[PDB]
Amino acid sequence: GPLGSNNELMPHGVKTKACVAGVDQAHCSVESKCYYTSISGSSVVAAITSSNPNLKVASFLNEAGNQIYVDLDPPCKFGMKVGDKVEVVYLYFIKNTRSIVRGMVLGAISNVVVLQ
Amino acid sequence: GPLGSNNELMPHGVKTKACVAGVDQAHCSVESKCYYTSISGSSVVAAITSSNPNLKVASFLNEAGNQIYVDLDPPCKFGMKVGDKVEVVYLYFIKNTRSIVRGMVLGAISNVVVLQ
């Protein structure tokens, strides 16, 4: 099909909302921005961004409105357009995110990435 | 690393240029738009878009400035913002494109996708 080999499930859109993150799960006190797409009518959180390079865990509500915690891969860094300013932003994908979903986040921010 | 399990190679940016496509390689007479990213300092063509739903083969120049042909997966369709108009656009990934690279194209156009 459209996505190829073992196919299958196509993700829709990239959205943004606040969340919290920390250097461990007991300390998610750093407000951050998370990226999520929709797969089979359900939200899937893919990545978070932050000025902080030391984050290890993110937290947010799930579909059922419950508070959950997810592990983070080590961060990529980018220079991103923020107004007339350029800032260093750390981008953390969530542990075990699908490759196509990782790409979707990268695609969504490419317009705004000016250093890498 | 940042992209996880068997890692590895991170794609950079999504760019756009004209190319040609057709229902077979001998007949690539349909001007189309291709999407490409950069991987290891080299351009990688990932997808083409077209109003035509019957395309099977795309053609363009490679890094070495040579004319090549690539097979297309079957197309996804989208309604895309084009000015004040909304149009049906067929999006074809190129045979065997990496999942993360497919996602990057989807991410890049998500801003502009209004039906799916």
**Mind giving me the DSSP string for A30-73?**
EEEEEEEEEETTEEEEEEEEES-S---EEEEE-TTS-EEEEEBP
Q: Chain B residues within 8 A (CB-CB) of chain A?
A: 1-5, 10-14, 73-76, 91-93, 95-111, 113, 116
Q: Look up residue A63 and give its two tokens.
A: 């579909």
B4–A111 CB contact, under 8 Å: no
Q: Look up residue B102 and give its two tokens.
A: 């497919």
What is the total count of domains within chain A?
Answer: 1
The technique is: X-ray
Collect all residues of chain B within an 8 Å Cβ-Cβ radius of residue A116.
12
Host domain of residue B77: 1-116
Report how far apart, in Å, the C-alpha atoms of A110 and of each of A41, B3, B30, B48, B104 are. Answer: 25, 16, 28, 18, 9
> What's the rounded Cα separation, in Å, for the pair B77 and B116?
7
What is the stated resolution of the deposited model, in angstroms?
2.4
> What's the rounded Cα separation, in Å, for the pair A115 and A112?
9
> What's the rounded Cα separation, in Å, for the pair B21 and B52?
10
The C-alpha angle A111, A57, B39, rounded to 5 degrees, equals 35
| H or E stretch covering B60 | strand B57-61
8 Å CB contact between A46 and A101: yes
User: CATH number for the domain including B49?
Assistant: 2.40.10.250
User: Min CA distance, A64 vs chain B (Å)?
Assistant: 25
Q: Look up residue A76 and give its two tokens.
A: 């990529």
Sheet of A57-61, strands arranged across: A67-71, A57-61, A12-22, A30-39, A42-50, A85-93, A76-82, A113-115
Identity of the residue in A92, A103, A111 whose CB atom sits nearest the CB atom of B102: A103
Q: Look up residue B15 and give its two tokens.
A: 């760019």
What is the radius of gyration, based on Cα positions, of chain B? 14
> Is residue A108 classed exposed, middle or buried when 0-12, 13-18 and 19+ CB atoms within 10 A define those classes?
buried
Residue of B93, B116, B88, B115 whose CA lies nearest to B104: B93
